[PDB]
Amino acid sequence: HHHHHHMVHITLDRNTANSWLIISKDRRQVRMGDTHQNVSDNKERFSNYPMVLGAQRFSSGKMYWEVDVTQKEAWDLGVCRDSVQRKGQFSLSPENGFWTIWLWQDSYEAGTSPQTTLHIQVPPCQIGIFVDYEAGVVSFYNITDHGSLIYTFSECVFAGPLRPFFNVGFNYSGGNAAPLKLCPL
């Protein structure tokens, strides 16, 4: 892929974060805290899951960014509609406004309904995410394996502005404390 030149500087939006997340001063890293982080509740915060949005909103053009997932056992990454549900239980699916992949229990899957098995030979330490708004495309790349394609959502019906989407995952096991980090350009 030659998508690197549509690189965008993504930062995390504290106001959208689940109340147990800790976002770094530079707004480029997020991790699960071991407790509530002493913030007020608001209607933007994801209540049920350890999720947070990027601050950037996209309604046109081509955008690319990279996320470091080193040593995590579980995570979700991609984009979502600005208007996705924040409270209660929900599925990650395009019907609900999400275009995502994830790691869970030693398998990688795309957030279709139902979910799609991914075939990754080299476990990724960094994931590249490409959005073409006009084409209706969201693609995922394995930066650890020379940028190899992981998955393409096509014929996407975005139906509104898009935001970068992150889930650091729970840490029931004590093996998933590591952060998600936005990688430098």
Ligand X SMILES: Nc1ccc(S(=O)(=O)Nc2ccccn2)cc1
In this structure, are residues 116 and 151 in contact, taking their beta carbons and an 8 Å threshold?
Answer: yes
For 54, the token pair is: 């990027």
Angle CA 32–43–13, to nearest 5? 50
Contact pick of 169, 176, 180, 181 for ligand X (by CB under 6 A): 169
Letters for 59-78 (x = contact with ligand X by CB under 6 A, - = none) are -----------------x--
Letters for 88-107 (x = contact with ligand X by CB under 6 A, - = none) are -xxxx---------x-x---
Contact pick of 42, 149, 170, 175 for ligand X (by CB under 6 A): 170
What is the nearest approach in angstroms of ligand X to the Cβ of residue 168? 9
What is the nearest approach in angstroms of ligand X to the Cβ of residue 6? 27
Comparing CB distances to ligand X, the nearer of 60 and 105 is 105
Give one DSSP letter per residue of 145-157, joined into a string. Answer: GTTEEEEEE-S--
Site for ligand X in 21-50 (CB under 6 A): 49
d(CA 23, CA 161): 23
d(CA 50, CA 47): 8
Cα 32 to the chain's mean position, in Å? 15
What is the nearest approach in angstroms of ligand X to the Cβ of residue 135? 26
Comparing CB distances to ligand X, the nearer of 54 and 169 is 169
In this structure, are residues 111 and 140 in contact, taking their beta carbons and an 8 Å threshold?
Answer: no
d(CA 63, CA 133): 8
What is the nearest approach in angstroms of ligand X to the Cβ of residue 119? 18
Q: Which residues bind ligand X (CB under 6 A)?
A: 49, 76, 89-92, 102, 104, 167, 169-170
